[PDB]
Amino acid sequence: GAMNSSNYAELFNNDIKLFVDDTNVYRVTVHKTFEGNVATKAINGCIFTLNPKTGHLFLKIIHTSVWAGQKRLSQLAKWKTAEEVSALVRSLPKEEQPKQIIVTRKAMLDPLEVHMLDFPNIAIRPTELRLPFSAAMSIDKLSDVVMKATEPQMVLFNIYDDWLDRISSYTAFSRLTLLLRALKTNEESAKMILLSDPTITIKSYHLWPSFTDEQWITIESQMRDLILTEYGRKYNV
Amino acid sequence: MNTVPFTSAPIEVTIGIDQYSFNVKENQPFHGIKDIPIGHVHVIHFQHADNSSMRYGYWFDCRMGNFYIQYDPKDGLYKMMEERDGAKFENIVHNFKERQMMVSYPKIDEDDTWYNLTEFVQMDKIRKIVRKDENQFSYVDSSMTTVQENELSDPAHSLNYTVINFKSREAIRPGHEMEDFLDKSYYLNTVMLQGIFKNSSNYFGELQFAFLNAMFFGNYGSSLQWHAMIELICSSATVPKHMLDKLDEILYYQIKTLPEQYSDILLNERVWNICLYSSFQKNSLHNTEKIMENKYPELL
Ligand SMILES: Cc1ccc2c(c1)NC(=O)[C@]2(O)C(F)(F)F
Numbered sequence: 001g002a003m004n005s006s007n008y009a010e011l012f013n014n015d016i017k018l019f020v021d022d023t024n025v026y027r028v029t030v031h032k033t034f035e036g037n038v039a040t041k042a043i044n045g046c047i048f049t050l051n052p053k054t055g056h057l058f059l060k061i062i063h064t065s066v067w068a069g070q071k072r073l074s075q076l077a078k079w080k081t082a083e084e085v086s087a088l089v090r091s092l093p094k095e096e097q098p099k100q101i102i103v104t105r106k107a108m109l110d111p112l113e114v115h116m117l118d119f120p121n122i123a124i125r126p127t128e129l130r131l132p133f134s135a136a137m138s139i140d141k142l143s144d145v146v147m148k149a150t151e152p153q154m155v156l157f158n159i160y161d162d163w164l165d166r167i168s169s170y171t172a173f174s175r176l177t178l179l180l181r182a183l184k185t186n187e188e189s190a191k192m193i194l195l196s197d198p199t200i201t202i203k204s205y206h207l208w209p210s211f212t213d214e215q216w217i218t219i220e221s222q223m224r225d226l227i228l229t230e231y232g233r234k235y236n237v
Numbered sequence: 238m239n240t241v242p243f244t245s246a247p248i249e250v251t252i253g254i255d256q257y258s259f260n261v262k263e264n265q266p267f268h269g270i271k272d273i274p275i276g277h278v279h280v281i282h283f284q285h286a287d288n289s290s291m292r293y294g295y296w297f298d299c300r301m302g303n304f305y306i307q308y309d310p311k312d313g314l315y316k317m318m319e320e321r322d323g324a325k326f327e328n329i330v331h332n333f334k335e336r337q338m339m340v341s342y343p344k345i346d347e348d349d350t351w352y353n354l355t356e357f358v359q360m361d362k363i364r365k366i367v368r369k370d371e372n373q374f375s376y377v378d379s380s381m382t383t384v385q386e387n388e389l390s391d392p393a394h395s396l397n398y399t400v401i402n403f404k405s406r407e408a409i410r411p412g413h414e415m416e417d418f419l420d421k422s423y424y425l426n427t428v429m430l431q432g433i434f435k436n437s438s439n440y441f442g443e444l445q446f447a448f449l450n451a452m453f454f455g456n457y458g459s460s461l462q463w464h465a466m467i468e469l470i471c472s473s474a475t476v477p478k479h480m481l482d483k484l485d486e487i488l489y490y491q492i493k494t495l496p497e498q499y500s501d502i503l504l505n506e507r508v509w510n511i512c513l514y515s516s517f518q519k520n521s522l523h524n525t526e527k528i529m530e531n532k533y534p535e536l537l
């Protein structure tokens with residue numbers, strides 16, 4: 001059934017599983033027309049498909065041409081997501097295919113179930129966790145490849161960089177969710193924390209800076225402060 | 238006009254014949270039901286006074302044979318039997334009709350209710366849903382499960398309704414996943430009508446039979462089947478116009494007949510609200526929508 005705080009550590013066992021987040025698939029800017037009506041302009045988006053145990057991220061870039069001439073785009077976007085996830089699964093060797101796919105939004109259940117009818121043994125699950133994957137486009141290198149794309153494209157990343165050399169997947173996911181929650185609550189402040197010190201750089205093959213163990217502790221504390229703050233600045237506490 | 242005699246009535250029981258019913262007391266001199274209209278299927282059904290658990294009954298058509306009811310004290314129920322010796326059976330029925338020991342099928346002449354609930358129901362199709370080939374009549378009870386419920390356990394005692402499943406490979410063409418799931422016309426018209434049922438008459442017959450088993454026996458799997466067959470039509474953007482008009486009549490008479498006090502368990506809120514107010518056919522069931530709104534506005 002649904003994934004929640006009670007069955008947290010299942011994410012880090014040895015059964016292959018993927019999270020799928022669709023919140024950045026259909027992205028628009030809203031603007032006024034010369035007549036003073038409102039219109040939208042689509043911009044490129046992405047499906048965020050993540051193995052939480054290994055950090056492998058399958059970033060399927062959704063180019064705005066996929067929406068041309070289509071109606072009911074928010075509904076289409078869920079089905080397009082499920083189509084692309086199903087295509088990804090079929091593209092993997094059998095021993096790499098997931099045993100479970102966890103969707104971050106319940107509205108993805110039926111589209112994904114229908115696209116995966118050929119795979120009756122792959123469980124499609126919702127979750128009660130409020131995961132911050134919508135903030136993936138606040139990671140500069142991910143936003144850059146999405147915005148530069150001129151055609152549909154899949155790009156593979158490891159969202160944990162080399163962290164698993166030193167920490168567990170449980171700790172790695174904890175750090176990722178903390179960083180993304182911070183970026184979601186106050187992007188400018190979070191990015192300042194991450195980059196303020198110019199002596200700590202992002203390797204060309206990495207997404208995040210090359211912090212030492214000690215520096216990650218400071219960073220993580222700064223993010224936990226930011227989130228508690230904004231939670232005051234928001235609710236006045 | 239045909240007759241279903243009773244050997245005796247040794248246990249107190251409520252007897253139904255189609256939409257009618259009456260109480261028979263323990264050892265009352267009751268010898269059956271006369272004046273049964275020829276041309277329709279019928280159902281004779283039973284609820285014992287001591288154990289309202291298990292409603293049970295028999296679908297039959299008097300054109301197919303001479304049927305009588307005999308109480309079996311070993312199996313503890315009223316059983317339908319067939320007599321192929323015609324001379325012997327008529328001698329008894331007459332003998333009983335003379336002594337006035339039978340209730341008359343009490344059809345009002347104005348009244349087309351039973352025809353309207355069984356218009357497309359045929360014994361031959363009933364006998365394919367309820368498999369017991371040695372008999373010309375079909376037993377159904379409250380507890381019998383459907384082939385689909387068994388997939389999700391005795392197969393001989395099952396209701397073999399046509400399986401409908403909206404999230405199944407049969408319902409969804411590869412490459413039309415979104416199209417086929419949001420508009421079920423393919424599944425209705427090609428898979429089910431052209432492929433399985435052959436025509437809409439057979440589809441409506443199974444739908445009507447499922448409703449009647451849900452209403453008369455409280456058979457839960459039959460209720461599921463009835464709602465699935467409604468939803469499959471209402472969720473299709475492309476439906477023959479004659480089918481929509483007939484479905485409106487079918488459902489109108491079903492809703493009209495439903496006991497007011499059973500609406501809570503026999504009507505699925507989600508399906509009816511979806512069908513009447515959201516589906517492609519939301520504006521195509523005028524008679525059904527009007528009776529539902531005036532009789533069961535709570536459900537909506
Ligand atoms: C699994 C797990 C437990 C506890 C936490 C995380 C992840 N991430 C966090 O920042 C934290 O909230 C905290 F504050 F305790 F560190």
Ligand SMILES: Cc1ccc2c(c1)NC(=O)[C@]2(O)C(F)(F)F
Pocket residue numbers: 242243244305320325326329330
């Ligand atoms: C009405 C009625 C009652 C009972 C019977 C028939 C018809 N036909 C039968 O063979 C019999 O079972 C029997 F044995 F008693 F004659």
